[PDB]
């Protein structure tokens, strides 16, 4: 369920370090190690996560209803020295 995106400088660059919903903390940040996932909506889990190269929470209005917001949990495909921020991205923030 991963999507290639590469904060929003339209260019997108959200690098892993040694509008915001949460964070990913871990080492290899893949299925070979336990990683910590913190997401607000708070849900905090430690699992054998296989994270996306560009993990995020997609945000859109359900059928263009401004009173009904929905999101896509594009963070990992399966379920500390490095971390990255999980952003809330509207499609319009990435398109021309």
């Amino acid at each position: 369920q991963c999507v290639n995106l590469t904060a929003i400088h339209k260019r997108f660059d959200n690098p892993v370090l040694p509008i915001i919903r949460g964070w990913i903390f871990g080492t290899t940040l893949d299925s070979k190690t336990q990683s910590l996932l913190i997401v607000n909506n708070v849900v905090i889990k430690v699992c054998e996560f296989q994270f996306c190269n560009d993990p995020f929470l997609g945000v859109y209005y359900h059928k263009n209803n401004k009173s009904w917001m929905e999101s896509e949990f594009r963070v990992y495909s399966s379920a500390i020295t490095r971390f990255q921020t999980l952003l809330a991205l509207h499609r319009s923030y990435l398109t021309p």
Partner: antibody
Amino acid sequence: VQLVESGGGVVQPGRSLRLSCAASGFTFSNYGMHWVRQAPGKGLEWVAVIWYDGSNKFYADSVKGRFTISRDNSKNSLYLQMNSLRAEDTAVYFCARAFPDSSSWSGFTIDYWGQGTLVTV
Amino acid sequence: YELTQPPSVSTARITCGGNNIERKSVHWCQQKPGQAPALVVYDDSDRPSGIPERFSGSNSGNTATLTISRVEAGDEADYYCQVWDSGSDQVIFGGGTKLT
């Protein structure tokens, strides 16, 4: 807005075939594109979609790992490389222009369809 | 995810069932014999330019409907129901309903 498929024909099982679609009448680089196939006597079956910048490629479960979708914005053209074709892959292949789906973050429906090209395996 | 719709319909109403389909946008395309499909309805009830006001629709509960009023002989085509499945990033098509 027009789409023209080519590269169809007759092949044997186990062999590959590359299809292409020429786009004109619109800015190709601003739209995502779909491939859809229709076996004789059957309904429409989705094959793959590619984003306008070529960064994201999604495939139907039945073709994933065998078919590759790609685009060339400079040449205003769409390609589909089909490897290891089987008898079950006999169908008319269409290229089509994607349209944003309001119920999904980056989902698409299909707006403009080409005439399609027949591939027999 | 899959859609379910009848092989054919003789105002014509074409139904498209699914699991809580209300939460998904339903789109419809019309394919005439010997011709490519064309978009008729999108986002449940919106029409693209060129489509007659005769074409309308709705989406509620576990079913969606394409309603074609004042049906003409020129409408004798295979109408397909499709949605985007965000769970697998696939376009899901129904069997297709033929009008007569």
